[PDB]
Amino acid sequence: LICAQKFNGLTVLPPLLTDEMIAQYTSALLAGTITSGWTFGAGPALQIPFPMQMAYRFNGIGVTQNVLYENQKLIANQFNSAIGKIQDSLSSTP
């Protein structure tokens, strides 16, 4: 059983990075992505308004800059609905 892991000379070493500092790393990465786009991954983090960073990423896939700005509310609603659905997607299928 996992409750008593000692068994017979069977040591289970704990991970060096506990879940708390791993989550701190993930949160720092999230904040970097949100408030600095790709800039923080290649040097100092340069703040850039989110919608503008989204337009930049749109420019990277082919769609021009103005596609996002004229559809900002629609894209925001789509993103928020999808991120809402992902939790129920994980829950529904074990």
Binding site: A42, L46, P51, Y69
Partner: protein, 109 residues
């Protein structure tokens, strides 16, 4: 993938039972904060920069590339129009200096 930063070159170097790479990357520095804007309404039509970004020296407005600060006057060759300027959130107003109009006016008038 090839060194931290914007990769430029990679010179290999032989090592015993391995290889050593010299990733020559480009690291930006000396950043400066600037007031931006998604677009610049001039005559009721939004102007988005063809490349780079709209930045403001506090007072004036300019357009420059993202990874280096070379302020340039917002001309109609640096920006492309798309629709009216009532649907873009956060739009600012300014004057997109068209290069052709003063040129032709000085030529003729």
């Amino acid at each position: 993938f090839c060194g931290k930063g914007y990769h430029l070159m990679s010179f290999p170097q032989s090592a015993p039972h391995g290889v050593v790479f010299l990733h020559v990357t480009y690291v930006p520095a000396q950043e400066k904060n600037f007031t931006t804007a998604p677009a610049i309404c001039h005559d009721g039509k939004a102007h988005f920069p063809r490349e780079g970004v709209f930045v403001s020296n506090g007072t004036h407005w300019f357009v420059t590339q993202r990874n280096f600060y070379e302020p340039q006057i917002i001309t109609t060759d640096n920006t492309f129009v798309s629709g009216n300027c009532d649907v873009v959130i956060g739009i600012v107003n300014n004057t997109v200096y068209d290069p052709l109009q003063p040129e032709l006016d000085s030529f003729k008038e």
